[model samples]
Target: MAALTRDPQFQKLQQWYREHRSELNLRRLFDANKDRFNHFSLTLNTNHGHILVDYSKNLVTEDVMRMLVDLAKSRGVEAARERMFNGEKINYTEGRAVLHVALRNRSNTPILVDGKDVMPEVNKVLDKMKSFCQRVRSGDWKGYTGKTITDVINIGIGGSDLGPLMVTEALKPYSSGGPRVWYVSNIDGTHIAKTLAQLNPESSLFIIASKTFTTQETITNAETAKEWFLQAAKDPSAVAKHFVALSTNTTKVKEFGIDPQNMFEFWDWVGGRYSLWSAIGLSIALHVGFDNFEQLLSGAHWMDQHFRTTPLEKNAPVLLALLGIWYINCFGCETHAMLPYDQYLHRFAAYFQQGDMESNGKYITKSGTRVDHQTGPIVWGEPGTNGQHAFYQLIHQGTKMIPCDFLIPVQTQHPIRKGLHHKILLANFLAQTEALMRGKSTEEARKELQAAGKSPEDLERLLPHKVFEGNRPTNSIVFTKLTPFMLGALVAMYEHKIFVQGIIWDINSFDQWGVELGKQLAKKIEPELDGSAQVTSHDASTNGLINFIKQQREARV
Candidate 1:
């Protein structure tokens, strides 16, 4: 079932995408190349910026980028990118070693795993998260009313709250002077009761972030922020100065009171959607300043050295995972979009929609079979002029061929009004990749409705709803700002484009046993909600929703 769609370079990229995909015409491929953006653009550069990309409005060619880099060298992607850079366990179903690239290696190389060398316990948990983010950003950390700490809440869930709340909301201008961080990962006590209704459990500090101090919504919002910090520090020895723990159980973080040197450890080969460069980025090095979180892990170790040395036609995460594997297996494209015209990366497409749907959101195959084509691609988007006033009118008059990317920057950390609202946000990010690749036709919507005079019975009843069926696909990119080393090189070029689409979808993109038997059936419907008989111990819509929630909690007594 999983023989890479019967090879011959995936059947010559499905017979060259069923012969030039329904007569492909990005306006006759940009009116027959006016240097089709200098032959489908590239640039990259980067110590911190210069990205460019373009991907020449996408509906590809150049024999569709050399048969998608020969179907990524017949799906080995350079031996699965050198066994994830020499670590090798390759997360073979949790036998571990996807080594979140040795937590941003920064060329301190030695990546070995089972044969040892996890870069000296990942530089001893990044110098203990750089001496606990320099003792809570230089106020030399304190609390239990000895004050100083200020605010930071973090609790955590899903890669500890979407990679430190999408890199602390895209590094809020490198968090002016740190502290003030809040993020709760909802177990819905209205998200830790509106994040503890604005701080001060004597300068609030929480940060529980679960790596096994047991997760059930980050230990129930860290026991409801330790009963709202023991109702104002009534000493459980002041919950070890307003809590800490990213976690490694240290006997359940010293049975939840914390301070076994404030816990913080991270491993099991890192994937909680690629833990923000481990120690689950102690709330992104306590809100951007472990030297800009180690320059966002040395700009994601220079895009893991340009995805382990370029050449997938000068790779940018291997041509955006072979243009999302040529639109999720040849032009079927089940939604892609990411948008990001920098409203400081409003959770950059919800941190890659949980980093590309929990890494390759697969249909099995690390030879565990079942993979007859299509794998993952329902990633959604937001951020550009509020998705140009909501989903860019279903990606400009929809019928369905989506494929987007856009992102922007060409400098605008806030060039208000003089640069005029980022020059209408870089002209709606260059008119949405040029109106999604030159759409609108039917003789240019009947010559713009007869130059708006409109009378050929209103130009054949509004030229088939003002035409617009151009060959859609997009890509764009740009960049030059949004620093923390360009948001760690755009989160390491989308985590090496979701690890080259999980090495061309042979799957096990670092295991997720399909979201664990629905969390073991919500831990067996949570002890059948504690009481009253007449409860059938199983699914009749889960015994009528736990006997209608124990008959409405015994009608509130």
Candidate 2:
């Protein structure tokens, strides 16, 4: 339970890594070991399908892997995993159990907290969500004007918004007879206004998702949506027809004129980032049928079982976390790139941006001490082929050593384009991995320039710029295809990977007290923005900014 820096194994791994860092070359490692792929790569069979993690391309040897596993053992990652699965209060700062696994526990296993099984409550809400979604999808749940709902707007912020939005977007192909789903999370009025501009109030259903029903941005957007709906139905009693709440606040739901039966519930153990597996995922169910949603949960449960049973050396999430630790702490990499080759997974990276950064972007340790080492990497990426043109230039030839994960799907959703686009996409995916592994040397660049009939002078000029120092490390996560279940497994894999890193870093990954200060300050600054009051209780910079905003608004008016 000591700080990570104070642990002896961590120091030993640090020393071992530095000693062998220069010799850990990816190209040489590949050439020296013919069976390197078999040794380092792993294929996991999930409830939906299979995913292969080709980590052979990373900058790690057997010795490095062993030391990394030792570091994990020294840090007690297995014990932490057990604590989380067993419903212990691992999230010490919040005094809550970190048990998102219980949300998708499709096996109906009894998971206890305070001597009571939470399975019944979890399944009860899931049953309610299933029935409601079926009715809405079947045209039985009508709008105020007796029209079948055609559009759904999910109003929430942070975890409530991003997770479901990403899943619904990713699994758009599965929405056979379901309504189109849109999301509004930003406090910016334009976000809500622009979304509502495209839909009719008679055929739109709004699900307001906030655990406490008190998140400022979510409530503000929800109230605005209610007003917009009331404009169409002139009767306040009609509000229940189109408005539902994914919250625990029964009083707030009833007060807002939403029917009490429409208020779906989840537990505090379900963190916002992880709550999509709970009732917060009602939008996902509404779009992609409840069966697909259950399959998604099944896939995540399969991964949970694997992470629980697999050894550290062969475990996908464990290997991923340790490799990240090696690069971040030992190799000095600052950012991690997640490039999914499929366009369907465009928001995959953005979704995890909040998931990983918000969980592990910490400076303080669980032991009430400051960390000397980095906890989380700057997670950023775009879908591949698009990204290859954008910032991948820096990843390939730029000075910074960036570690990347290439998520490549072998099958395409469209078969004809699958023949055309899938080949081209896979070619690029494989080529990029190979190119990053074996970069063009100065000699190779000069030979190419000579073959192109460039003069000696031109060759000299071009060779320096063309030469690529290609020892970059990457992980190629190859999937058979992108399905609802596969997407769920993928997200859950990263979630567990993040948990491993948090345990290794000696920090509480659950609580996000850092996000509170901004909300509190925003509440104080709201009154000053409307010209109803002046901001006197602030620093000079803040006061000046508020006055400047007021002046600009007055001038515009």
Candidate 3:
């Protein structure tokens, strides 16, 4: 596999960037074309609602888009996507198929893996999730003390936690009047303690999510939760009613006191970052009814169809991925900002922080060679209106060029008729993009200062600080509203974007070997912290830190 930079199309893109970089201006581009917005934008009328993507504000033109499509074709992205849909083990390093798409295949399409159609099993687990969710939501599933479960706690880390956490928060309004859902992903004791402080053990239910049921952080938190539960119940048998496992290891789950029947199993084909649509989404179904959960699946399947059938020029995921690559590789941008205008999507940026970085933050390529160019962007953001008060200043006048994605909804779910909050929010959303594109010039600022009776000295003193080098690029994603289905489509869009980036970069996005090294070292360092074992086998910095920690502990005692 050759590096993407070596491709002829990529070379053409590089040449195009060098020749046109100076001439490419967002203001000029808009002025030159009357119909640029319509030409660059795409609107998909999904089953849930309409999603309008306005990439007209981006720096790319039709020729650049053509080059990007050519680059994708040259890099064999279509073939890779086809391989993923066909259930090929494209994740060669893990010897597994990247089949998160199959999890939400609502059409019951026959997808074969290992010479067997996995659709039956997929539907079986989905049916099980629906039954379990319905039972719990309706009070059919009771606690050991015969009380209804009022508080539901999800104990998992990484994808097990982030995916469900974001979805639940994003769709909080859709909660089925059932148990209040809480998530604990941090290995820190305070995270679980803070969550448990508000709940009664009798009415609290715990869902332990780990594929092998042996993730150290997840298991540690699960054990602590079990200890807390046992303190109230005083009977080990009561654990079965209060605890369930979203895991495949029946033996471990049974030993941990959860009934094997309560274990919701997902296959190895499901990667952690992409496992939400599988049985791992049981929390989502429990919070929102199973019908809404099915709608989520339907929405994702709809995007999956679009990604499968559409051409590269018009595909949403492909275009997003190409724009990301253009900024990262050609423009030398380091970070990408995901600014959601809606406050409900506060965790949306953090969710993709893990999803995009973990999946594509790789140095090694498919050919076992180091990549010489950049791959993934350092993704970060906060909810808008708040972000306007926080980082929008830096984004407006900062030295680094950051490509931002502004996601806004046309309507608000919680509308205050008299307060006019939605209108204010929408104004900020629309204004920020315009401001980013057409920044305040020094000449304009000087004239405004003169009009306000500022003297020449005062104007000169403030001119440099007030000048904004407008031309920062952005993409605005406008949706009808944030529904379960729309949120599902939104997440799927990013998932496929990550997949397309991995395909173009020629890296295995499914495997996460980088995270394993830290976990191994943390296990080694645990005994040293307790003073149960001497820790001599470490670098100078680590050794000094450990000895200092031990000395501090001794001093405190």
Candidate 4:
């Protein structure tokens, strides 16, 4: 309710950070504590596989961990978890319940919203998408030219595109009998233009994602998609043959010439950042089999159950959020890195950038107030070996301490090279967390330099650079292998972690107001860019930028 710094547990953690900052070395931590690994690490036994979260390499003592969990407890994480699961309007900012968990409620539990069970409606929509997915995958859904749909292009923004795109991409190998999915979020005409160029009109299906047939960016891209789709058909009556929608507005969809029966509905409680498990994931269900998609939901359901019932001390999501708070508030870490070992998961980090950053990016609390504390870190990362070759030097030896999370499958999807390929990946995945934890000491650096036959003079010159401050923290998340089920579980795990962090910081993680300020200004500026008219309605910098764009407008599109 007040500044996080005013909290007693925060003060305790802050005090520890100050007094023991220099002494909290990882090498000494392992040397002093025999059961350090057993104490810090946890294995989650889910229906899919065992997920091992190794946090022993982090810079934390038992007291620090206790203080962190205590802070979360005092911050009301448990009550908030129950509220979200109970379908209470936790997102009071919007008068809606933050219930993405309900979408994947595999137990078919009766979650109430305004005294009504949401389970029946959830089943109806899921069954609708199930039939649609089967039809599409079985080649029963055909284009106007009677050809089986080979490609599907989903046109939507934010929750409509990001989650489905990320899920479909990571599960690319699992689409053995499914069509290729091309997701187009708003990039401009060129992106849609590029997407349409490779597809035949007779063999492609288009999904227009929206709750109400609106969203300026999404609609603009949708218009571009429709514009391109009509070139081959020539008859507007054939629109229903290839174009369907993810909207609740049957009237508006029918007005757009789409079949009203084909319009899929998702509730308002189905949020933009968390709609992939809802009907908005038609593309995912269409690209990957509906069975696979259900497994994805089932996996997340287990995580939801785990987060709801598990204790704060052993809870995966709670522990992750607590550790994150430790580094963010006490250790002063600003950026969190997500380095995945699998290439299929390249966009996994970017997807959560939207999930976490957009959700907790607001410093304003749920009570319409500001807190003078860090709310969320800048979430970023890429696939591992690619990052190792790019900016790993920064994580390894950079000045600023960046808390990195390394995720890897114990078994690779491609078990080629006589399983050596996967072994190599596992090795690199294991090595990086350790390398960051146990960096070369000055003595080891000197001995290694001597073994390399470098003179003492040269050794001294290289030793200063070679000796790394090796107490860098990392979390290694290991799963048996990457599957649709495991991917769903992992995504939900991160989602729950963001929710806990938001609750701890007292920020509204569901409602997003920061993204609309630019849109409000862009609408006014758009018509002003008609001709060579210099406008002085904005700041000098923006005025000059707008006039400059006007000067170059005649030569461009």
Q: What's each prediction's clash count?
A: 1, 0, 0, 0
Error of 1 at 175 (Å): 29
Candidate 2 C-alpha lDDT tens digits along 1-557: 34888888889888887787778778888888999999999998773577999898998888888989998999999999999999999989988988889999988889999999999999999999999999999999988889999999999999999999999988999998999999999999999999999999999999999888988889999999999989879899999999999999999999999999999999889999988999999999999999999989988888998999999999999999999998898888999999999888899999999999999999888878889898899999999999999998899889999999999778888768439978888999999989999999888988899999999888888789998899999999998888888887889999999999999998989989898898788888877677546666799999988877766775744
Q: What's the CA RMSD of model 1 in angstroms?
A: 24.1
Q: How does candidate 4 fare on TM-score? A: 0.98
Lowest summed lDDT window (length 10), candidate 4: 1-10
For candidate 3, what is the lDDT? 0.91
> For model 3, how big is the CA root-mean-square deviation?
1.4
Please write out the lDDT profile of model 1 over residues 380-481, one tens digit for every residue: 888888888986877789788888888888888777778988888889889877877887779877987898898898789878998877678788888888
User: lDDT per model, in order?
Assistant: 0.82, 0.91, 0.91, 0.89
Q: Give me the runs in candidate 4 sitting further than 4 Å from their true place.
A: 1-3, 555-557
TM-score of 3: 0.98
Candidate 3 residue-wise lDDT, 492-513, digit = tens: 9999999999988888888999
C-alpha positional error of residue 37 in candidate 3 after TM-score superposition, expressed in Å: 0.6
The residue-by-residue lDDT of candidate 4 on 10-51, one tens digit each, is 888888889988888899999999999999999998967999
Query: What TM-score does structure 1 among the candidates reach?
Result: 0.35
TM-score of each candidate structure, all chains considered together: 0.35, 0.98, 0.98, 0.98
Tell me the deviation in Å of residue 244 in model 3.
0.4
Q: How many backbone clashes does candidate 1 have?
A: 1
What ranges in model 2 sit over 4 Å off? 532-536
